[PDB]
Amino acid sequence: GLDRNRQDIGYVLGRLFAVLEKIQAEANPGLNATIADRYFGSASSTPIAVFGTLMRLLPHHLNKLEFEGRAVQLQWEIRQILEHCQRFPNHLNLEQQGLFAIGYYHETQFLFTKDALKNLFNEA
Amino acid sequence: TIEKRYDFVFLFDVQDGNPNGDPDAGNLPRIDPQTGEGLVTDVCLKRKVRNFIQMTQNDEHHDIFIREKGILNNLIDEAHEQENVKGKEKGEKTEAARQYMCSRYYDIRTFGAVMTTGKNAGQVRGPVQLTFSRSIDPIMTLEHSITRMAVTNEKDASETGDNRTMGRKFTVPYGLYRCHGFISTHFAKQTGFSENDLELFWQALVNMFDHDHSAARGQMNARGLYVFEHSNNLGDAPADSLFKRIQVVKKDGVEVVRSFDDYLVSVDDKNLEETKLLRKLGG
Amino acid sequence: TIEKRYDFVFLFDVQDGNPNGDPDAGNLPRIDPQTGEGLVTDVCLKRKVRNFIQMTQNDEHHDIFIREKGILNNLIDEAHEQENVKGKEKGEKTEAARQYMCSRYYDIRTFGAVMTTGKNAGQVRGPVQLTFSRSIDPIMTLEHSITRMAVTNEKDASETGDNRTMGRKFTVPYGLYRCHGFISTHFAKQTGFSENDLELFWQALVNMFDHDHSAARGQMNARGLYVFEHSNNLGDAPADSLFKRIQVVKKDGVEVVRSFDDYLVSVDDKNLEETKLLRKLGG
Amino acid sequence: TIEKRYDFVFLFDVQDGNPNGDPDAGNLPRIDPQTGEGLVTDVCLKRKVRNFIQMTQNDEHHDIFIREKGILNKTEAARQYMCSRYYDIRTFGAVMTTGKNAGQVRGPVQLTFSRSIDPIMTLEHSITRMAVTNEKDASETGDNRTMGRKFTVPYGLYRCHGFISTHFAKQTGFSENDLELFWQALVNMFDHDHSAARGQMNARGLYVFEHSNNLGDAPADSLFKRIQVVKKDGVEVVRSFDDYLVSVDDKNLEETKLLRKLGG
Amino acid sequence: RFILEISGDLACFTRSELKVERVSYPVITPSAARNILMAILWKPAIRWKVLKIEILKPIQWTNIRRNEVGTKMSERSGSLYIEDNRQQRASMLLKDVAYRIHADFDMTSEAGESDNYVKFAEMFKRRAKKGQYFHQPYLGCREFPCDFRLLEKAEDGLPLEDITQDFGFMLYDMDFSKSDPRDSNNAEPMFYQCKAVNGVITVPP
Amino acid sequence: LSESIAAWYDDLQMVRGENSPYPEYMPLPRLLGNLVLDGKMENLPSDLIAQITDAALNNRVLPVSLLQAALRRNKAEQKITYGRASLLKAYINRAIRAGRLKNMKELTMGLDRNRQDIGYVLGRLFAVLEKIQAEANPGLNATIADRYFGSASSTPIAVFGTLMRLLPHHLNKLEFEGRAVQLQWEIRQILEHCQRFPNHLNLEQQGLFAIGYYHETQFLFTKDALKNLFNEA
Amino acid sequence: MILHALTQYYQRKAESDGGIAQEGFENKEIPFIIVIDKQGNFIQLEDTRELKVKKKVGRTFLVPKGLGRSGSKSYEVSNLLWDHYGYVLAYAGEKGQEQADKQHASFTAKVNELKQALPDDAGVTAVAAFLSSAEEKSKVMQAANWAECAKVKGCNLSFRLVDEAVDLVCQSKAVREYVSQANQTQSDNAQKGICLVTGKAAPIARLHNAVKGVNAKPAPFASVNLSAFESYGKEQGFAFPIGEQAMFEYTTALNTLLAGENRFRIGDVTTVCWGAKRAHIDAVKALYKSLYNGQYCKPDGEDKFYLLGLSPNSARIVVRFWHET
DNA sequence: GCAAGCTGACCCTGAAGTTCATCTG
DNA sequence: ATGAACTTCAAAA
């Protein structure tokens, strides 16, 4: 149950946050709390106070990963997800705030599988 | 007792640290999820005033109740061992115990608590009622985390000496919160809130953040206190207008706020000196 | 007694706090589950008016009834000890007691209560009838919770150190509720509602939220009061049109609402100049 | 005396409050058990009309007789006198025991249990009171607080169908003056009878069809199917009258029938 | 044979055995249909009588209790006061019901000089086709409407197709033979029907 | 006539978690007593308890007042246990049995992880969040259910917009990371069916909300079930 | 078919021999039972209560049918052998004197006329001489368990003679014939037909009997009073042309159904059920056995007949269930 | 730290016999 | 002489 052409800003913002949370979870096994365990509390409200730091920290996580192909796939997914982001708004509407979590959990469920991201990238 | 009504607006700023924490968010600051504006509950300010009064007074007729090692049932049983033992009729014994608790314990007349435990004794409303705080400019969240080289219990550490449990301690880059508070007259007459108690409460308000401090809350102080006093129990003007007079807006060019120079404060006190007086204490 | 009919629309705003908490859902604000719009019951406004009148008057012919130390049976037994003892026929003694309670107790003419306990004495309808409140823009729920370092009763939560019970105190980011109220004529003639009582009721309405405050309700005030007066007991125009004149809509660009500038209010009074008068009190 | 047949479809609404609760189920507004649409008994409409008449008259030949204690406190010759000295008798009828047809004064007016269009949502607001009543087991010595219970609806649009003949109007006395008084009531009687439980409730429509002959010239089913009051397109739940779409069908009654829009 | 379509949204055919607690019959009362036919068109020269009734909508009980009165209306007491005459009187209504009646009429004793069968026949026909009526018909009680319509054969389906259930002795019609004009003293002789086929077939006295 | 009792009691079976004091077949008086405020003396004997069993013992459509009073009591008790869950499905499953409602289908006794309705998945999500809060803190004072159930079974965005930020910190407070990972997996598998958060939930969807809430709650109370489902991730 | 099906069910249960009323009797719950000998002489104040968690008003016994009191001068009714506690010993804890003594006078006049209308029985003579002795009625209050029947009101009292200890004074084959003739010859000289549920003759049953079990008081099922409850000026009772031989039957059927195993209330409404026996439903009545087992099956023997879910209020019975399926 | 006390509702309105007071008789 | 108010009946799950 995922729609890449949702044409909603909250949905793609949530999916981007979800790919970032997946990056944080895959960065190191031994971790007590991911980035979503402190950033999701304010990313749903003010996404500019979270996504900038997450994108600036993504290079370090990619450097401390374990496979470059997975990093390329995940950054391509991030690009194709946030391509719909026309402008970072000052405040997120509560409907958009809910769509944020909807897209977040949708993208996390889509990523935490087996062979899906590579299969989707095969047609690109 | 007092015969005038009071409505005070308290503007207090925090430079670094978490003012009020969220119970179901580990330690995230209580920020409006739909506008990004910070919110500080009145219970934090009330507990800070309680701690200040307990630290400054330490005498009779100026109680606050202790911390952690205090039981409400024990305090009620102690208060029910004076003249209102059993020969006072329970229907009137409750009122007698309420009056005695209001007269002997200053915290009840300041910020009353609960009186219905194993032995009921009424309930106190209290004329002093504080409201929640709100920030004008939407504050941002930093999500600053820290670590610790020590281990709590020997179960969450690693398989060697590398003991680490991480940790989280949020902070606010800057936040000027505005709180509102009301003091009536009839409740003060029923409880016993006089003018000396009012002066002590104003002193506690103006010296609130000037004493109680910690590590998670960081640096917190005050900025201003604008009080409107009605010379009677009647209100010749709505409180919304008086709350809208003290207008605190952001800078003309700077989009964020970091000090008092960024928050432009304006006071329009032209049409409010009919039967009301204006006082300034915080600044 | 009064001869004119009155229909008033009262727009009142709340910045932070729970206006009318539902006893069912612990403390959740009464919000429409199908549209997200806030709803405030009229009983809260009536009780606030009662408290204001009790605080301001405190004299004869201006009763309100006391708080929790009041028994309806005792008040009825006290009212049934004047001239209408027994020699008045119970069919006519009920009417006599009703008239005496309407004349001596101003709260009965304002917002009547019940008169059927151990000794029946009729029933009062009252010309002053208030309706429920409704918000135009759908408000949001914050679900703000707090904690407490003290412990109530010595239950299972009394640990060896941390004796915390948490707590819940909801609040509204912003809410402009709109209430409707009606005042007839025949009921005022049967009870005794005169013009001075009408002026006192208008004063209580315009000074409702300006006095009674607390911690859970937070900051609450008023915004406007538009009253339509019919010069007779007949209605030459339906009240729905008058209620649709005062149109309060949201902002043109901002989706949410935070202050009076967000709520755009428009008044179209170009038809109510026949046998009806328009008055403004709140703003 | 009127000599025309009248069929009036009365559209009223309840914004905030109880339109018509149920004494058999506490006080919840009457709804349908199957389709879920709300219901309002016509007896409440009749009582509100009686109350409005009592408020606007208070004189002879225009009383109500069927009144309340808390609000207002040979054979055919006596029957005609009782019909003349009251307004409700000329409107809704009487049950004069000393009558002819088994003691029955019918009357031209005949309303209808107004059924709501869409299934409403009964909101049960269990409130409370800071004062007890009799010395019960729930009135402890500590605090005297009792819990309450109210019922409301976010919005309920009900539609009644009333009929008015002329043969009974010639027998009772329901002339054109009584007809105009009944119209002025229907267009403005909710505003005069308000309370706390009923809350806010007003009238939003009253479409009257007057027939040329003293019996009619069109069936009532077609008249009811003409005035179509439905829900708009992009509206699921309703909150006010601006979400309903009402359309009249005056394209087939222009023969020998007059149409009046006293409500909307 | 005159075919009529008696429809409605609610029905409350109050039984005579339970009047303080109104209970509607599972079908339409023959006396109710006769009173409907009289309210549509009647004259002291034509005696209305029901021949066949066919049900078109199933039973649909809705519990509706009202605050009714128990006191009559007279000329001595000038008021009423419903506070001392309150009665919690229930009335199980029949939501969404429709019936068709195939009936005819005969003559009476005071037929006079204008007792033409064809005249009253065409008069009732044009009244049913053009919605004319003397008094608005009632479906159990006058609190419900009756949007009648003239039909010819079968223009609406019927769910009661197989053998459903019986109804017992139902109120056919009161005995107006032992009474002067303007009834005042008469009994309520109830009668049976047939079984549980498509509807209730009334039996003439 | 016993066929109506059979069709009423075959659906009356619910999930019923472990160590539950509620029997398998809830007593009909005790089953309808969950619609009262406290004692079985002051209820609503007409469109409720005086018609619910009427429609029950005859394979007829249950009244809508049943759904209304069930939502009222869920707003009151702030938690739906074995009493209204075994009675809210009686209205929807019977309405779909005869064809009268909208597009939703019937229900079962277990936890159906499909359906794709906009109200049932919301209740499943709310129950998952409630169990996450319960596992994060064994004791407290009032669950997030006791705080949200007033309007969460109707308004998705109005409460979940300020609720989806709480389960991350709740999982952080968990001393066992595997439990948090399994809870995340199950909430993702559930929300995969939720297309979007609507502005509200219809009257026909709030009952599904409560049913899914009770289903997921009593499913997560099992001794070993969440781990068994997470084994196939 | 409100009372028609009930009458048909009563005609099925009456001819089945299973503890049911007949002719002019009713199964009443008598708490304390007074046992005497042959000529007055109060010798035992027996009580047969202790049943459920609350001390009910004794066991059930087939006493004569209650004529239906409830009125100002209620002593003018004067039942046969069973009544109130003020009709036997003229005692009144909350009723007061005068009003209670006339009740005892009416009761002793009733038993005296029953004795003079039916002598040679060794049963009615005992209760007739017990009320005209003025030395044992005062001794009744000084019994062994008399302090218990005074704290609870509505205590019915019955008489049981010696040499039986199993049959009351209204159970021997003598007064039963008188009671049967009372509802056959005395209660049949009134208004003619036609009946409402049987279609035959039968006199119009004026003042319907009271049903005990639904409400706290014996609440009549269908009874017209006040004034507006009339159709064509029938004036109280004649509004429903119901015969005695059917009204009595349905009232006794509701009394037997409101005190047996089929009596169970779900909530403010007693949803009693029954069957046609051609009862053995074991479906609706099986909602209170022990711990709710699984007795639902499919033996192709599902009996028909509806169930009456009636509810109380003040003193009337409201019908809400009606479904043949 | 799975909450504290706090209810979860007022009063009636019945059937039938006995009094109160104004209609043509 | 008969419509409306008065007074007694059991002590609810």
Tab-separated table of N, CA, C and O in Angstrom, chain F residues 69-113:
chain	number	residue	atom	x	y	z
F	69	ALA	N	-24.546	4.202	21.460
F	69	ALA	CA	-24.265	3.985	22.874
F	69	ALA	C	-22.923	3.298	23.084
F	69	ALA	O	-22.247	3.561	24.085
F	70	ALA	N	-22.511	2.429	22.158
F	70	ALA	CA	-21.202	1.801	22.278
F	70	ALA	C	-20.087	2.828	22.132
F	70	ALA	O	-19.109	2.800	22.887
F	71	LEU	N	-20.220	3.749	21.173
F	71	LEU	CA	-19.238	4.822	21.048
F	71	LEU	C	-19.254	5.726	22.274
F	71	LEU	O	-18.200	6.180	22.735
F	72	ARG	N	-20.443	5.989	22.821
F	72	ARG	CA	-20.531	6.800	24.032
F	72	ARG	C	-19.798	6.141	25.193
F	72	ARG	O	-19.064	6.806	25.934
F	73	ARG	N	-19.985	4.831	25.371
F	73	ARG	CA	-19.322	4.137	26.470
F	73	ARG	C	-17.824	3.998	26.230
F	73	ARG	O	-17.042	4.013	27.188
F	74	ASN	N	-17.403	3.859	24.970
F	74	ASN	CA	-15.977	3.877	24.670
F	74	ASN	C	-15.369	5.240	24.967
F	74	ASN	O	-14.199	5.326	25.356
F	75	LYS	N	-16.143	6.312	24.785
F	75	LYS	CA	-15.685	7.632	25.199
F	75	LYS	C	-15.705	7.774	26.716
F	75	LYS	O	-14.923	8.551	27.277
F	76	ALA	N	-16.581	7.031	27.391
F	76	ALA	CA	-16.717	7.099	28.843
F	76	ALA	C	-15.657	6.257	29.551
F	76	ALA	O	-14.791	6.794	30.248
F	77	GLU	N	-15.720	4.934	29.385
F	77	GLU	CA	-14.741	4.052	30.009
F	77	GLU	C	-13.339	4.233	29.445
F	77	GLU	O	-12.377	3.788	30.081
F	78	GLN	N	-13.203	4.862	28.276
F	78	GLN	CA	-11.917	5.119	27.632
F	78	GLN	C	-11.164	3.834	27.299
F	78	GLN	O	-9.962	3.871	27.016
F	79	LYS	N	-11.856	2.699	27.320
F	79	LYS	CA	-11.278	1.410	26.967
F	79	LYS	C	-12.412	0.424	26.735
F	79	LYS	O	-13.340	0.338	27.544
F	80	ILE	N	-12.339	-0.303	25.625
F	80	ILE	CA	-13.358	-1.275	25.252
F	80	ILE	C	-12.786	-2.664	25.508
F	80	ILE	O	-11.837	-3.095	24.840
F	81	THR	N	-13.351	-3.358	26.488
F	81	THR	CA	-12.927	-4.699	26.849
F	81	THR	C	-13.936	-5.712	26.303
F	81	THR	O	-14.683	-5.422	25.361
F	82	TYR	N	-13.964	-6.909	26.887
F	82	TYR	CA	-14.884	-7.945	26.443
F	82	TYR	C	-16.307	-7.604	26.869
F	82	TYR	O	-16.772	-8.049	27.923
F	83	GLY	N	-17.002	-6.813	26.055
F	83	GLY	CA	-18.360	-6.414	26.357
F	83	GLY	C	-18.981	-5.603	25.240
F	83	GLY	O	-20.131	-5.836	24.857
F	84	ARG	N	-18.226	-4.642	24.712
F	84	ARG	CA	-18.665	-3.863	23.563
F	84	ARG	C	-18.034	-4.322	22.259
F	84	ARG	O	-18.609	-4.092	21.191
F	85	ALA	N	-16.864	-4.962	22.319
F	85	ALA	CA	-16.270	-5.526	21.111
F	85	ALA	C	-17.087	-6.705	20.603
F	85	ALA	O	-17.285	-6.856	19.393
F	86	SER	N	-17.578	-7.542	21.514
F	86	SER	CA	-18.483	-8.629	21.171
F	86	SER	C	-19.904	-8.146	20.913
F	86	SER	O	-20.824	-8.969	20.848
F	87	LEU	N	-20.102	-6.836	20.773
F	87	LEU	CA	-21.412	-6.267	20.491
F	87	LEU	C	-21.397	-5.193	19.413
F	87	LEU	O	-22.446	-4.947	18.806
F	88	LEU	N	-20.256	-4.551	19.151
F	88	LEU	CA	-20.190	-3.570	18.072
F	88	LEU	C	-20.172	-4.247	16.708
F	88	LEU	O	-20.753	-3.731	15.745
F	89	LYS	N	-19.505	-5.399	16.604
F	89	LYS	CA	-19.507	-6.148	15.353
F	89	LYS	C	-20.895	-6.656	14.996
F	89	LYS	O	-21.154	-6.954	13.825
F	90	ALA	N	-21.791	-6.762	15.980
F	90	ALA	CA	-23.138	-7.252	15.724
F	90	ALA	C	-23.918	-6.345	14.784
F	90	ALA	O	-24.821	-6.823	14.089
F	91	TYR	N	-23.596	-5.054	14.745
F	91	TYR	CA	-24.288	-4.121	13.865
F	91	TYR	C	-23.732	-4.160	12.445
F	91	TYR	O	-24.497	-4.149	11.477
F	92	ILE	N	-22.406	-4.207	12.306
F	92	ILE	CA	-21.795	-4.135	10.984
F	92	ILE	C	-21.864	-5.488	10.285
F	92	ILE	O	-22.223	-5.578	9.106
F	93	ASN	N	-21.518	-6.562	11.003
F	93	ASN	CA	-21.535	-7.889	10.393
F	93	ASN	C	-22.943	-8.305	9.989
F	93	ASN	O	-23.115	-9.040	9.010
F	94	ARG	N	-23.959	-7.846	10.722
F	94	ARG	CA	-25.335	-8.152	10.347
F	94	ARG	C	-25.811	-7.259	9.208
F	94	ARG	O	-26.614	-7.691	8.372
F	95	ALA	N	-25.331	-6.013	9.162
F	95	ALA	CA	-25.695	-5.122	8.065
F	95	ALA	C	-25.111	-5.609	6.746
F	95	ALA	O	-25.763	-5.518	5.700
F	96	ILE	N	-23.883	-6.128	6.775
F	96	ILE	CA	-23.296	-6.683	5.560
F	96	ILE	C	-23.890	-8.054	5.252
F	96	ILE	O	-23.914	-8.478	4.090
F	97	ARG	N	-24.386	-8.762	6.271
F	97	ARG	CA	-25.014	-10.060	6.037
F	97	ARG	C	-26.280	-9.915	5.201
F	97	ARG	O	-26.615	-10.802	4.407
F	98	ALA	N	-26.995	-8.802	5.365
F	98	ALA	CA	-28.232	-8.560	4.637
F	98	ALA	C	-28.083	-7.545	3.511
F	98	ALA	O	-29.002	-7.412	2.696
F	99	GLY	N	-26.959	-6.835	3.445
F	99	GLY	CA	-26.765	-5.816	2.432
F	99	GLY	C	-27.586	-4.571	2.696
F	99	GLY	O	-28.770	-4.511	2.350
F	100	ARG	N	-26.965	-3.566	3.313
F	100	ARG	CA	-27.653	-2.325	3.646
F	100	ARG	C	-26.653	-1.202	3.894
F	100	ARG	O	-26.969	-0.025	3.690
F	101	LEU	N	-25.442	-1.553	4.328
F	101	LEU	CA	-24.432	-0.547	4.634
F	101	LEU	C	-23.771	-0.025	3.364
F	101	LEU	O	-24.421	0.080	2.318
F	102	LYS	N	-22.487	0.295	3.440
F	102	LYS	CA	-21.766	0.944	2.348
F	102	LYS	C	-20.920	-0.111	1.631
F	102	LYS	O	-21.496	-1.084	1.134
F	103	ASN	N	-19.597	0.031	1.553
F	103	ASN	CA	-18.771	-0.884	0.776
F	103	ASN	C	-17.973	-1.856	1.637
F	103	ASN	O	-17.410	-2.815	1.097
F	104	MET	N	-17.916	-1.642	2.950
F	104	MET	CA	-17.172	-2.542	3.817
F	104	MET	C	-17.802	-3.934	3.820
F	104	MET	O	-18.962	-4.124	3.443
F	105	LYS	N	-17.018	-4.914	4.252
F	105	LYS	CA	-17.428	-6.311	4.260
F	105	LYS	C	-17.651	-6.774	5.700
F	105	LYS	O	-17.622	-5.978	6.645
F	106	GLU	N	-17.874	-8.076	5.859
F	106	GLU	CA	-18.124	-8.659	7.168
F	106	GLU	C	-16.838	-8.716	7.990
F	106	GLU	O	-15.771	-8.259	7.566
F	107	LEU	N	-16.948	-9.287	9.184
F	107	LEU	CA	-15.839	-9.404	10.119
F	107	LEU	C	-15.723	-10.847	10.599
F	107	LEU	O	-16.600	-11.681	10.358
F	108	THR	N	-14.619	-11.135	11.284
F	108	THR	CA	-14.348	-12.455	11.837
F	108	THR	C	-14.069	-12.321	13.329
F	108	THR	O	-14.231	-11.249	13.920
F	109	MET	N	-13.644	-13.425	13.943
F	109	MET	CA	-13.326	-13.435	15.364
F	109	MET	C	-11.862	-13.138	15.651
F	109	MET	O	-11.536	-12.737	16.775
F	110	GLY	N	-10.980	-13.323	14.675
F	110	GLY	CA	-9.568	-13.070	14.836
F	110	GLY	C	-9.170	-11.689	14.360
F	110	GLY	O	-10.007	-10.807	14.139
F	111	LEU	N	-7.864	-11.502	14.195
F	111	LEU	CA	-7.297	-10.228	13.759
F	111	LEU	C	-7.009	-10.322	12.265
F	111	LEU	O	-5.991	-10.882	11.850
F	112	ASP	N	-7.912	-9.773	11.455
F	112	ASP	CA	-7.745	-9.774	10.008
F	112	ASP	C	-6.780	-8.662	9.614
F	112	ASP	O	-7.042	-7.483	9.875
F	113	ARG	N	-5.668	-9.036	8.986
F	113	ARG	CA	-4.637	-8.079	8.581
F	113	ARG	C	-4.803	-7.622	7.140
F	113	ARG	O	-3.817	-7.459	6.415
